Amino acid sequence: HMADQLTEEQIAEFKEAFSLFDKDGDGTITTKELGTVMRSLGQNPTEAELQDMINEVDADGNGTIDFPEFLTMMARKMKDTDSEEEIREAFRVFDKDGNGYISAAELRHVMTNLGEKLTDEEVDEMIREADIDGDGQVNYEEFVQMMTA
């Protein structure tokens, strides 16, 4: 949903961008309006591709781009940036310091913040399971292949 993907500030910024394209203010983006801003940016496209880049996001097929369609375009662009990198943030939650290894103390820190509590001994049980190298720290490579700590 747009509320999940976009914040109030981003919606305001997109509206200003939409109004930059819509010099008329009627609420729709025509080919000439889209072509004008492209020339200001240096590009000189033809109407054949200019229509194509409109039809690619025009939902109702009226031939013009309104704000609901403009927001829907930007909502997809924000969403599809992250595809499978969600494990990177999950790794950094356990990795407080910022290096490439998860320490037992760092695993204690996240477990302390979470509801479940450890008796300072079973923390070694799952870290040695995740850490195959046996160095006492779980790196990023060990975390993605199998997640226990």
The residue ranges that bind another protein (CB under 8 A) are 1, 3-4
The answer to whether the annotation marks 24 as part of a ligand binding site is yes
In the complex with another protein, the residue whose CB is nearer, 2 or 147, is 2
In the complex with Ca ion, the residue whose CB is nearer, 73 or 118, is 73
- Residue 131 CB: number of other CB atoms within 10 A? 20
- Residue 49 CB: number of other CB atoms within 10 A? 10
Helix (H, G, I), strand (E, B) or coil at 6: coil
- Residue 142 CB: number of other CB atoms within 10 A? 20
Q: Is 78 left (phi over 0), alpha (psi -120 to 50) or beta?
A: alpha
In the complex with Ca ion, the residue whose CB is nearer, 81 or 114, is 114
The answer to whether the annotation marks 80 as part of a ligand binding site is no
Who contacts 141 (Cβ-Cβ below 8 Å, separation ≥6)? Answer: none
Q: Which of positions 47-76 make contact with Ca ion (CB under 5 A)?
A: 60, 62, 66
In DSSP terms, which residues pair with 65 in a beta bridge? 29
**Annotated binding-site members for Ca(2+):** 22, 24, 26, 28, 33, 58, 60, 62, 64, 69, 95, 97, 99, 101, 106, 131, 133, 135, 137, 142
Binding positions: 22, 24, 26, 28, 33, 58, 60, 62, 64, 69, 95, 97, 99, 101, 106, 131, 133, 135, 137, 142
